[PDB]
Design an enzyme around this catalytic site. Structure first.
Site, PDB file in Angstrom:
ATOM      1  N   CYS A 170       6.631   4.593   0.346  1.00  0.00           N
ATOM      2  CA  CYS A 170       7.383   5.837   0.268  1.00  0.00           C
ATOM      3  C   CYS A 170       7.735   6.357   1.669  1.00  0.00           C
ATOM      4  O   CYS A 170       8.714   5.877   2.241  1.00  0.00           O
ATOM      5  CB  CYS A 170       6.726   6.849  -0.684  1.00  0.00           C
TER       6      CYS A 170
ATOM      7  N   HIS B  90       5.525   4.477  -5.817  1.00  0.00           N
ATOM      8  CA  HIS B  90       4.077   4.394  -5.717  1.00  0.00           C
ATOM      9  C   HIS B  90       3.555   3.296  -6.661  1.00  0.00           C
ATOM     10  O   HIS B  90       3.208   3.622  -7.797  1.00  0.00           O
ATOM     11  CB  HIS B  90       3.440   5.765  -6.026  1.00  0.00           C
TER      12      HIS B  90
ATOM     13  N   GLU C 107       0.709   1.789  -6.588  1.00  0.00           N
ATOM     14  CA  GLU C 107      -0.719   1.986  -6.749  1.00  0.00           C
ATOM     15  C   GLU C 107      -1.137   2.658  -8.067  1.00  0.00           C
ATOM     16  O   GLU C 107      -2.256   2.433  -8.525  1.00  0.00           O
ATOM     17  CB  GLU C 107      -1.291   2.723  -5.527  1.00  0.00           C
TER      18      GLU C 107
HETATM   19  N1  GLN Z   1       5.418  10.460  -1.711  1.00  0.00           N
HETATM   20  C1  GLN Z   1       5.603  10.468  -0.399  1.00  0.00           C
HETATM   21  O1  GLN Z   1       5.022   9.678   0.342  1.00  0.00           O
HETATM   22  C2  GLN Z   1       6.566  11.509   0.141  1.00  0.00           C
HETATM   23  C3  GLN Z   1       7.546  10.978   1.204  1.00  0.00           C
HETATM   24  C4  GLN Z   1       8.545  12.043   1.724  1.00  0.00           C
HETATM   25  N2  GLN Z   1       7.834  13.238   2.288  1.00  0.00           N
HETATM   26  C5  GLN Z   1       9.534  12.504   0.596  1.00  0.00           C
HETATM   27  O2  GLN Z   1       9.438  13.661   0.126  1.00  0.00           O
HETATM   28  O3  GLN Z   1      10.312  11.601   0.225  1.00  0.00           O
END
Ligand code: GLN
Ligand code: ZG4
Ligand code: ZG4
Ligand code: ZG4
Ligand code: UTP
Ligand code: UTP
Ligand code: UTP
Ligand code: GLN
Ligand code: GLN
Ligand code: MG
Ligand code: MG
Ligand code: MG
Lengths: 540, 540, 540
Positions: free
Chosen positions: B391, B509, B511
């Site tokens: 991300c 994500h 995970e």
């Molecule tokens: N879930 C995260 O790692 C957030 C990544 C980033 N701050 C966003 O809002 O895209």
């Protein structure tokens, strides 16, 4: 700011509201600007959801706050004007904290009851205590907080925990706790029982508040041995043990606290610097002349459903130096289905109605008892018995009038009979709620003279339904007169009828503005008319 | 529906979540469809308000529910998919009741904690227990409810009172209470201490629940005299006293409950009709080959901030039959201001980073440690060390790449440097949150092969910021490749880089979808690449 | 053995003793052998330490147990004979456990409240429940245990904890809990208040007992909405909510429980297989003829100081088919110092005394009011008003007689005036306490005929002081006659006087053996004589 927390011990209903109000009027007589807060531990945001059977009547504030009748006790004892946020609730607090959480204001921390709800309660109490409620516009010096419910209620826990923190945040010279408890006196053994009071004070101390006065609601005056036992087992001085016993009138209740040194205690403790109540009581105890008013109510199953209405009648009665016999009638008794089903209570209710000097038809919502109110108004119109219709009673009087004098046998409010061909009362929105200005349209109106010959009036409303502007002139042609109208002219707010000593409909709630020293003019005019002294009054 | 309430005794953090999950996986192995509910007594509606420091990571569900990591334990132990309402909170309940009150649904009655909040909790639990969470689409047979916090928490009181009522509403064959308690073993006297457990069970019984199993979180196996003392002073049979002691792996925890007859107890009590866990544990205890991954995190101050990320790495490690050394690095250590201010922790962090086989840059929000993540990605790109960017780590890798290979020294996310002339990552909304479909754009992508050669992928998102579509082709020209895109094509969801063994950014994500039997393909590819077995894997 | 625990809720004095006794007489009418235990949570070993002002009169058992008046209610409702250990106390239990500890019987283990005190309570209750108290000599089938005090008392805690354990040790078919609570009805709001009852039941449940019947002490019959609210907020069926309201006589109290299905509930719950009370009540409610007795007491400040004495008079009155007006006189009012200090209460007391048909001088210890008893006896002797002297009243009558008819102006008891030259009553020991045999010395005695013409009598004593054997013949010469003597002849146990309709001294306590169906012969003879029917009775 000085804070006095009044907590309830064993039961609600033991006059904790009038004790809180008496404590305030005591401190007001000491020259202090006093405000008050009511905490209602219910999850309801306001009292606008309730029937008059739940907690008594829904009292209405200038801002349109639909609140508990203890706010009306505060206004009636203190001559203040309160706002919505002087009625604190668990609903208000939890919604405040939840909205604040969703906005991110708690900064990603876990929002808990302690601290965040208990801080919010303290924030609210400090915030609201500084608000001028006195018509002087000055900042209060004392805030009397009544905690509703009992100290053992699960709902009261965050408020008591908030106040436990508060007594360290705010200093001990600025915080005092009064505990209003019940002392039973069983007919079995005849002794006054300290046990529930010591158990209640033990609970209060387990939650970290120590009662600085313990106020025993006792029927009879307290035994010395029982006052001793309370001082022992509740771990306070005899000085701190008050008994507020049964007394002749409400007007004796501040005097009884004064006599027990409550004045002296507060002046001392809070590091600070009643002859009207005496003479009101002394006049009340010397009433001989008697007047009777038929209260033809929907909610009459519980007396507190018409609390401020009864208070306004009693103000008016005492102001005309008469004793009062309010003939509480369940309006469903006057409805002809009770003549077939249970004629005993029909004829009892009608006997009451016939034997009253004046007729009061108070407010309400829903169909039950509405035709009984129309029955009573018909009686009052025909027999020329003094009539006050309040809100529903104005609406139903306009209906009753049309059913006779226009022959509109089908006529009703759209609330009750929407399929009528004569909707003489119609929905005219949400609720017209709180203070608005009515303008007087005629100098010759009895109500204008009673309201000091003023061109306008500001009074408290709580209505959706209004008299129909199309049918207005059909009614007004026949010797009805809509003497009070809204600033827009669209809403008929006071009506009088010609060729009757006092047949008045008011669309608002005069009872909320009634004080002992200033009885609400429609209730005063009713009482005056019921004694035949209204012409004499108007002539003077 | 059978209900098992798991209550916490002395402290949070004693593995009550994995006990609840183990109880569920036990009952799942008994052939039952099992669902679970987490009650979090906080006033927060969801975990979306929190940092990863408050309660650990915010776990994300298919519906976009931002919830407690115990829901991730439930999904990882049970192979179910949960929804928002499986995470119950005080905020959810009070807002439900308040909204219902304002709508008039409580019919003018005084809304109280008991009954109305406690009924709402029971309604919710019954409602949600019937929802198919198993991918089979069948109705659950057992609902395991974990009550978070401790039984002595003020916030837990309505939930315990609700469950007190519930055990009579629902019958005793359909309700069971497990109490997870701590048994300390002080180094002073060496004895295992029953006192906090008996006090906690006494509190629980004072609130009207009797523990049907008492589960002692013990470090060492329970003494017979202590198990006896618990059976006495907690008023339960020795049969009902479990000790969940320290064991070699998580995979031993269901086995340890099975061994203590918890299976038999539930089958008996609830009137009902683990070799995978055995072989996972036995393989784990026989690992010799070791792999190391640098976890270059922002939140690394508390390990549970990257809980499911660590779990996914451990799944992947065990699946490749290697032991794992996660080199937890605070990314602020790699930022050059630490080279001037505290060079010891700079060189420690860099020594860790240099000595890892693979680099993981997990997710996060806010500027702190972002340049340290860019530092680590630069290292990983240049040295050709296997890289997974998750991300934030995808976004920062696209940035890092542009800072080098396009010379855009000013480049960043608009989240961090909005005044850049190269906003290579931009806000593209609210939050893209929960499950969406990514489409694979190239057969030759390593990630497509790892994801089973499927044309699409459905994965869980939690992002506002996306790679800039205007700058896309400038990046992609230089041997970057945005192999995974959204169904609209506007959002770049997976990126690979040419001439590197494994340099992958994923915008989602992975995970949260990782299970022991099915390690998340990006974490698996990272682990495979870090051992040099990725070509061999792809060749097979 | 079936066990019924009767717990007290809000206050003592709400008739919990007569409810426990009524529950027993109900079960006795179901054909069961019923015993009872009173637990008094005070640290006092026995009631022998108390004044009659503390808890009411000290009731005396056959074994010489000085106990609470609830044991007298048990004997009077059930026709059983109890022993010392049927009055359990905290003093008894702690001393038992301490003595057992000092003897080494707890085997070097730490003796604690739980288990060792709570086990001792269970041991005691089981031990004592098996003891034949019924004159049949059969083992009881039901044991009704009354827990004195309130459930919130700190002292009650070990007993409630003992009973919490007991309901698992003994099975649910063998254990039932009744909770006697107060429901206030304030004159303010007129509603019956459930709040103290739900709070009390919540406390009881917090201590691990759930009330199987909740018995509301209500003044008026229970409202349906209030019985509903109790069933809700106390979490029991409407079936389980009893109201024991005010009724015309004590004889209606078992009938009122029977009517509410308490009989049916117990027969069902405890797995088990009142026309006398009806006709006693129906006769009581139809009394027209009235008799008055002057009760010239020392302890008359509290009525329950002469409880069984009043009960015996009421038995006797109903047996002769008369209503009774007991003229309760404080004997200090008749003492000439009150003629100088407060002549109003002197002449009130004398007006009462003069207007009574018979005179009762009950027992007591200490000098206060003794000369007022002598004043009343002088009146009774001279005016030939029917006289019963009980214990002190026998002793003081022998004194009064000597002061007149022997001219011994100095004469008194050695208890009061030890420096007299005529100690006509002397100490003759410790206390002659409990049941002993008196032998009748003359066939012509009125008391022998009233006691069925039996040669002996067994009655309950509580005296140190006896009539002087040396002065006996000086008194007896003058037409006094010591018709009842002890088996040793040394103690004068009944005295009569010649040339009077009924002037009897009894040295014992007949009131403790009085039952409704068998009024105590001295009190019966007094009532008969006061109506002039004693000659007619003796003639038949
Ligand atoms: N879930 C995260 O790692 C957030 C990544 C980033 N701050 C966003 O809002 O895209
Ligand atoms: C702890 C209280 O203990 C006790 C002990 N003994 C008696 C009372 C008692 C309670 C209420 C009432 C009552 O309601 N009386 C009425 C009235 C007229 S005016 C008004 N209240 S008022 O308008 O606020 C005005 C004062 C400022 N009330 C006639 C309707 N009368 C007596 N209260
Ligand atoms: C009351 C609990 O008592 C005890 C007693 N002794 C030890 C442990 C214990 C607790 C947590 C851990 C742990 O977290 N280990 C890891 C892992 C891999 S897989 C996974 N969990 S998982 O994905 O849900 C999968 C199972 C379904 N965890 C390596 C990271 N390992 C041991 N718990
Ligand atoms: C929870 C109780 O609720 C209620 C409700 N309403 C009323 C009463 C009530 C309580 C006591 C009394 C009382 O004491 N009355 C007297 C008497 C005569 S005989 C005797 N008791 S006795 O000898 O044991 C015999 C029965 C076996 N008592 C005249 C003195 N009368 C009425 N109790
Ligand atoms: O002054 C107030 C304000 C609020 N409330 C609130 O109203 C709810 C009911 O509190 P009550 O004391 O009326 O209790 P109840 O109706 O259960 O019992 P009885 O009247 O029969 O004794 C509770 O939520 C309490 O906090 C009051 O009782 N009084
Ligand atoms: O310092 C002292 C003195 C006395 N006692 C007393 O000893 C008794 C036992 O109190 P403990 O705290 O030893 O409890 P326990 O044996 O039930 O539980 P664990 O040790 O397994 O934690 C109690 O009666 C207490 O007041 C102490 O515990 N410590
Ligand atoms: O039936 C019984 C037996 C014993 N006791 C015991 O007597 C003691 C006093 O318990 P009370 O309930 O009489 O309380 P109190 O005197 O403090 O308060 P009031 O009477 O003014 O309400 C306590 O120790 C209790 O357990 C009773 O109250 N009643
Ligand atoms: N306040 C009242 O009496 C209400 C009257 C009527 N139901 C309305 O809504 O206008
Ligand atoms: N029981 C009593 O009346 C006591 C009488 C006298 N005080 C005695 O001890 O003999
Ligand atoms: Mg109530
Ligand atoms: Mg110990
Ligand atoms: Mg007492």
């Amino acid at each position: 700011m000085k804070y006095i927390l009044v907590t309830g011990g064993v039961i609600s209903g033991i006059g904790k509201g009038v004790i809180a109000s008496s404590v305030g009027t005591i401190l007001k007589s000491c020259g202090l600007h006093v405000t008050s807060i009511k905490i209602d531990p219910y999850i309801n945001i306001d009292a606008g959801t309730f029937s008059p059977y739940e907690h008594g009547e829904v009292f209405v504030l200038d801002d349109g706050g639909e609140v508990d009748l203890d706010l009306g006790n505060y206004e009636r004892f203190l001559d203040i004007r309160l706002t919505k946020d002087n009625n604190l609730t668990t609903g208000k607090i939890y919604q405040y904290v939840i909205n604040k959480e969703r906005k991110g204001d708690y900064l990603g921390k876990t929002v808990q009851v302690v601290p965040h709800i208990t801080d919010a309660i303290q924030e609210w109490v400090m915030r609201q205590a500084l608000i001028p409620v006195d018509e002087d516009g000055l900042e209060p010096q004392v805030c009397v907080i009544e905690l509703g419910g009992t100290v053992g209620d699960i709902e009261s826990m965050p408020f008591i925990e908030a106040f436990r923190q508060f007594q360290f945040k705010v200093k001990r010279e600025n915080f005092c706790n009064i505990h209003v408890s019940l002392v039973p006196q069983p007919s079995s053994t005849g002794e006054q029982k300290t046990k529930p009071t010591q158990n209640s004070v033990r609970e209060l101390r387990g939650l970290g508040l120590s009662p600085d006065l313990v106020v025993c609601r006792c029927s009879n005056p307290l035994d010395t041995s029982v006052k001793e036992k309370i001082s022992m087992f509740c771990h306070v001085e005899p000085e701190q043990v008050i008994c507020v016993h049964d007394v002749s009138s409400i007007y004796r209740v501040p005097l009884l606290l004064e006599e027990q040194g409550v004045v002296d205690y507060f002046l001392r403790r809070l590091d600070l610097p009643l002859m009207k109540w005496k003479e009101m009581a002394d006049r009340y105890d010397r009433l001989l002349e008697t007047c009777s008013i038929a209260l033809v109510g929907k909610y009459t199953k519980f007396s507190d459903s018409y609390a401020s209405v009864i208070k306004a009648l009693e103000h008016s009665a005492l102001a005309i130096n008469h004793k009062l016999e309010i003939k509480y009638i369940d309006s469903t008794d006057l409805e002809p289905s009770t003549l077939q089903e249970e004629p005993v209570r029909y004829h009892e209710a009608w006997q009451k109605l016939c034997s009253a000097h004046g007729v009061l038809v108070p407010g309400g919502f829903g169909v039950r008892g509405t035709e009984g109110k129309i029955q009573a108004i018909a009686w009052a119109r025909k027999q020329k018995k003094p009539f006050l219709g309040v809100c529903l009673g104005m609406q139903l009087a306009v209906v009753e009038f049309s059913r006779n004098v226009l022959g509109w046998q089908d006529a009703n409010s759209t609330e009750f009979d929407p399929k009528t061909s004569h909707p003489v009362v119609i929905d005219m929105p949400t609720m017209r709620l709180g203070k608005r200005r009515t303008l007087f349209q005629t100098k010759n109106s009895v109500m204008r003279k009673l309201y000091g010959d003023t061109d306008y009036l500001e009074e408290r409303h709580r209505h959706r339904f209004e008299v129909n502007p199309v049918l207005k002139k059909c009614l007004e042609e026949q010797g009805l007169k809509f003497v009070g109208q809204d600033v827009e002219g669209e809403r008929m707010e006071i009506v009088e009828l010609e060729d009757h000593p006092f047949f008045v409909g008011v669309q608002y709630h005069p009872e909320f503005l009634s004080r002992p020293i200033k009885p609400s003019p429609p209730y005063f005019g009713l009482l005056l008319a019921s004694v035949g002294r209204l012409p004499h009054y108007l002539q003077k």
